[PDB]
Design a binder for these strands. Structure first.
Lengths: 94, 88, 97, 767
DNA sequence: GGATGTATATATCTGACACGTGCCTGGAGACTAGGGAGTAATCCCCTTGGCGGTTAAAACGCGGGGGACAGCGCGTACGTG
DNA sequence: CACGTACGCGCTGTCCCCCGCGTTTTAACCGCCAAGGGGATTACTCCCTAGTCTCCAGGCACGTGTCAGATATATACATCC
């Protein structure tokens, strides 16, 4: 059974930030639960933002407002920056 | 008389006095009064019956007899006590 | 050579705050979970990871409760925790409210 | 190497080191002769003042000056025990041990001496317990083994010869440094054994190095001088010749003789033959159960006294003492240390505990006793023992086949890795000729690797053992509990129970409980008592309720009365200790001197119960057993009748159950009664048990040292009556014995007068 | 002459990496409809700066006394072995 | 379970700061312009973009063989008693 997880992506992010540091299975499950929880919170907040504005679509503006609402303080403004640059690169490309 | 029952009922006393003392040592408590342990047992019973009732409701929505760990995760998640390390 | 009353408690405070093992034995907790579960319905099976997750939930909840209880006891100019400190913390959190 | 990703967040640097030091907390922190064991007391402190004032009770201060106590001190050798007094001690460590000894022994000793409600049985069991405590404490004075000797300088004593002494029942953590003079004046035999072990030529470094150079075995027809012992029998010599013939081709095997034939003597003789004759005096490993391990230790002490056999138990410090005082001839060297011992005796627990310190030893021979414990390939003992670097292995058991062919496959994979490839199971409902060819191939494949000797082929004086299967009707309470469980009736199952906590998990277990007794279930006795027994509970109706509640205890009561009016003693084996509690309470309110053994009883009280039951002046009539307890080391010479109340899934467990009385030397015809409930879950239990017995009679019993007929016998379904008097088709018949005793008949009028008189006397004397 | 510390060579563990393979899920290309962007109109609500008049609430001062806090005793309940 | 001692609690003093009351100020509140922009609807038009469908290919997961670093012995030279 092919069980979906975020294993290799968190592992390559770890190799980006710490190329000589490993990780255990319980810590990997905790990281997977964290990524799923944050994705669920941001997606639910963006769905509520689309519902209150009578919008049937979810764009980058709803996700940006969800990050600015849920993530507190300076963590929001750097995360908003990191996402915003990526959308710019992807537009340059697709 | 060798008569005794199969079902044990004093398992709330199975949470022993040094276990509660270790819990308070992790909580940073220096001195413990003697009436602490019964109150801690009652609080643990109330919290456990709340979480287990929600987990049993989550299990019988799925028409199952086995309480999985994911049902416990969802039961803790609904009350705002979300737990990591078992969701996947 | 006897020790002063309080330095042993401080040693256990500094010891148990470093390690992360479960401070409650597995079998009495499993028996307590099964006894609590069996009144809602009979014939309940339990995964081991479910009882383990219940165990760490009880650990975190009770450790946070004793931190709030210790803060209540320190606020009342005491170093000994009492059940009135426990009932005061739960209320300000909203559990007794 | 270098991180390619960084954080632009200007968070402060946090020291995450959670390691702590208590050096600053040393202001309240820290910056061997004391009383350890009290053994015996004497009523005269200094001199006998007189026999007056022998009444009343003494207090603690009265006992402080009236008694002298035997003291074994800290780090002492049980030979410097001193008769001391409270004023002669002062203030030393362990004084409250003496206080607890004094108060506990003196208060309830004078309480049981001065009470009026004291029976002779209680005073004789406590007196024999006191005598056994006395001689087990006196056993510590005798040395057992000298480990090491040294030259130690005392206070202006020049040089003194000091011996490291181990005692009989103590362990290596209690080994003590003692003077040479009193040791050689106490037991010179152990000293001369120590100097015989000193200039040793049987060391593992002086070993033969046979690399496919096994000498041809000449079939010896006499006991060699290498084994001193007594005298090996003809079958023991045959087993020795078989094992040497099997070792001569470099092949492993199973000594699968029946218990009681002295397999320990045979494997000790083979170990001695490997030590002396073939010059294979290297390190050998023997893994034995802990309960039978003194019975191996005295065998090594008697039959092979020249060998360097060592014993391996204890805590961490005792095993460390064995490790760095007795394993290595040169333990202080930093290089590869050669061995000093020849045979190491150990148990499974210290194999799983110390596999790292025992796997790095080039073992020459391996002997695993009770190989059915190794019947599971996925059990951790299998990977613990299979990873050992051992040239030659050997398995000692009595039951090679218990449940299925996979156990034998795991055993022969432990013996021959990869040579045997047993994979196919045996289907009894197939009747195919290729299956019989597979059965004959499994016969002819393991002919030289299995040696079995039955208890009827040798020692032709054994009385015959007959087993009878009794099938009895269920009671109405048993029938209604059976139909409530099988056709689940939770509302009817709770009924009058206040808790209502009836668990219907493990349906087959609840069906077995219902087939045994309705009183096993919670809140079940009071429904029988209030509705039919009238609920008076006046010592007479409760025995009637226990008799008539289950359909098995009416036949059991008839059997007990018949064996009571004859000269027989009966054992009753049960799977559940709650049914043992039911029978024990029934015999306690009956007035029959009974004894009990189960897993909750410690080994000392088990020894007390066995010695009380095997005494020639025993008033005990019935002895209750849990089936899977105690191993094979339990002695029941005085027993005659064995009643199997509950049939086991494994028939070898039942075989060792009625083999407790049917050993070598029984003077009476052993008779087995099996109590079976009719039309219940136990019938397919007996079906599976008989299928396993047919399998064991097919493969194992026909390959010692008509196949289609026994396959057709195993494929078919089976389903002056209690007389104590009297090839595989026998002993499988079903005797449907149901006399159906009446509820009123359950009580006896003759006993009723005795019960009423006892109740009236208890009401008159209160208590 | 026996016993002891250091130095290079070979077998074994152990996580990581190259290759193989399935398969299924994500991507490329085309089409379409509808959701959202944009425009105009209309009308109500909010913004910033002023005014006038009422008046009840806010600010200020001062006496005093109730309560917070410090010190001392004690005995018991909890720490410690 | 025994001992012992530290701390929770009760009592008393003391002083200080908050409360109650009277008097004076002052801004909240209500009612007013004065124009102008923001925003909520109603209706309409247009067009871009995301859903849907088909097809394909490589990313992910699993399994397995190897491989370089770390660990544990095997034997030889230097050295103490």
């Amino acid at each position: 059974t092919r069980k979906e997880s975020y294993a290799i992506y968190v592992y390559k992010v770890l190799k980006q930030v710490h190329p000589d540091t490993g990780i255990s299975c319980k810590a990997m499950s905790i990281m997977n639960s964290f990524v799923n929880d944050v994705f669920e919170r941001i997606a639910g907040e963006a769905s509520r933002l689309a519902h209150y504005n009578k919008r049937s679509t979810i764009t980058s503006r709803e996700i940006q407002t969800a990050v600015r609402l849920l993530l507190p303080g300076e963590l929001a403004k750097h995360a908003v920056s990191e996402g915003t640059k990526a959308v710019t690169k992807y537009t340059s490309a697709k | 008389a060798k008569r005794h029952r199969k079902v044990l009922r004093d398992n709330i006393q199975g949470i022993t006095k040094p276990a509660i003392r270790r819990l308070a040592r992790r909580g940073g408590v220096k001195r413990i009064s003697g009436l602490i342990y019964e109150e801690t047992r009652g609080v643990l019973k109330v919290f456990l019956e709340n979480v287990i009732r929600d987990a049993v409701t989550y299990t019988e929505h799925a028409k199952r007899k086995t309480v999985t760990a994911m049902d416990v995760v969802y039961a803790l998640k609904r009350q705002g006590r979300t737990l990591y390390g078992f969701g996947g | 050579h006897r020790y002063r009353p309080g330095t042993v408690a401080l040693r256990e405070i500094r010891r148990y705050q470093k390690s992360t093992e479960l401070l409650i034995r597995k079998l009495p907790f499993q028996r307590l979970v099964r006894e609590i579960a069996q009144d809602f319905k009979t014939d309940l099976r339990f995964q081991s990871s479910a009882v383990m997750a219940l165990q760490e939930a009880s650990e975190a909840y009770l450790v946070a409760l004793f931190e709030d209880t210790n803060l209540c006891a320190i606020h009342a100019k005491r170093v000994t925790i009492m059940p009135k400190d426990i009932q005061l913390a739960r209320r300000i959190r909203g559990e007794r409210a | 190497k270098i991180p390619t990703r960084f954080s632009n967040r200007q968070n402060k640097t946090v020291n995450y080191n959670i390691d702590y030091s208590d050096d600053d907390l040393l202001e309240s922190e820290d910056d061997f002769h004391g009383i350890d064991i009290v053994i015996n007391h004497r009523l005269k402190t200094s001199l006998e003042e007189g026999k007056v004032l022998e009444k009343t009770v003494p207090d603690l201060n009265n006992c402080k000056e009236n008694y002298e106590f035997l003291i074994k001190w800290t780090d002492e050798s049980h030979l410097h025990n001193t008769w001391e007094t409270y004023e002669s001690i002062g203030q030393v460590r362990g004084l409250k041990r003496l206080d607890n000894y004094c108060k506990q022994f003196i208060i309830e000793d004078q309480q049981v001496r001065l009470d009026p409600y004291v029976t002779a049985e209680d005073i004789e069991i406590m007196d024999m317990e006191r005598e056994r405590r006395l001689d087990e404490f006196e056993e510590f004075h005798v040395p057992e083994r000298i480990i090491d000797s040294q030259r130690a300088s005392l206070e202006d004593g020049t040089s003194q010869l000091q011996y490291l002494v181990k005692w009989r029942r103590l362990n290596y953590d209690e080994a003590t440094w003692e003077n040479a003079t009193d040791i050689v004046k106490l037991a010179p035999e152990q000293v001369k054994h120590f100097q015989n072990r000193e200039n040793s030529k049987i060391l593992p470094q002086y070993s033969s190095n046979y690399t496919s150079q096994r000498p041809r075995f000449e079939k010896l027809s006499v006991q060699p001088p290498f084994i001193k012992g007594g005298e090996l029998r003809d079958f023991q010599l045959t087993g020795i010749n078989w094992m040497a013939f099997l070792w001569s081709k470099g092949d492993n095997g199973i000594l699968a003789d029946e218990m009681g034939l002295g397999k320990t003597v045979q494997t000790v003789a083979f170990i001695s033959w490997l030590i002396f004759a073939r010059r294979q005096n290297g390190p050998h490993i023997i893994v034995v159960p802990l309960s039978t391990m003194p019975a191996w230790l005295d065998t090594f002490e008697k039959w092979a006294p020249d060998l360097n056999c060592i014993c391996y138990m204890g805590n961490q410090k005792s095993r460390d003492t064995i490790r760095e005082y007795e394993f290595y001839t040169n333990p202080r060297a930093k290089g590869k240390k050669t061995m000093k011992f020849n045979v190491l005796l150990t148990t499974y627990e210290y194999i799983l505990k110390d596999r790292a310190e025992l796997g790095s030893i080039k073992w020459q021979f391996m002997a695993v006793d009770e190989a059915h414990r190794l019947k599971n390939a996925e059990s951790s003992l299998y990977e613990s023992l299979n990873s050992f670097k051992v040239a030659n292995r050997m398995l000692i058991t009595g039951t090679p086949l218990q449940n299925n062919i996979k156990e034998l496959a795991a055993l022969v994979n432990f013996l021959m890795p990869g040579r045997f490839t047993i994979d196919q199971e045996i289907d009894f409902e197939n009747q195919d000729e290729e299956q019989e060819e597979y059965i004959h191939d499994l016969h002819r494949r393991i002919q030289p690797f299995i040696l079995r000797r039955l208890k009827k082929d040798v020692e032709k004086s054994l009385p015959s053992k007959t087993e009878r299967i009794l099938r009895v009707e269920l009671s109405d309470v048993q029938t209604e509990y059976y139909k409530n469980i099988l056709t689940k009736n939770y509302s009817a199952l709770t009924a009058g129970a206040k808790g209502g906590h009836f668990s219907l998990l493990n349906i087959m277990n609840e069906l077995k409980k219902a087939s045994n007794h309705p009183y096993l279930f919670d809140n079940a006795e009071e429904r029988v008592l209030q509705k039919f027994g009238d609920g008076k509970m006046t010592r007479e109706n409760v025995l009637r309720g226990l008799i008539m509640s289950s359909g098995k205890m009416v036949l059991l009561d008839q059997l007990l009365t018949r064996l009571k009016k004859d000269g027989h003693r009966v054992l009753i084996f049960s799977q559940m200790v709650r049914m043992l509690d039911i029978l024990g309470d029934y015999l306690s309110i009956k007035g029959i001197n009974f004894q009990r053994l189960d897993g909750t009883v410690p080994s000392a009280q088990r020894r007390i119960s066995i010695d009380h039951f095997n005494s020639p002046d025993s008033n005990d009539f019935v002895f209750l057993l849990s089936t899977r307890a105690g191993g094979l080391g339990i002695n029941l010479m005085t027993a005659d009748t064995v009643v199997i109340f509950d049939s086991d899934w494994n028939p070898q467990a039942d075989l060792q159950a009625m083999a407790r009385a049917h050993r070598i030397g029984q003077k009476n015809h052993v008779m087995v009664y099996r109590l079976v409930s009719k039309d219940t879950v136990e019938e397919e239990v007996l079906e599976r048990a008989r299928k396993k017995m047919i399998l064991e009679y097919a493969i194992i019993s026909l390959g010692v040292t008509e196949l289609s007929a026994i396959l057709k016998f195993g494929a078919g379904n089976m389903f002056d009556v209690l007389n104590h008097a009297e090839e595989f088709l026998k002993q499988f018949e079903v005797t449907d014995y149901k006399a159906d005793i009446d509820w009123d008949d359950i009580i006896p009028e003759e006993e009723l007068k005795k019960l009423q008189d006892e109740e009236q006397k208890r009401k008159d004397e209160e208590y």
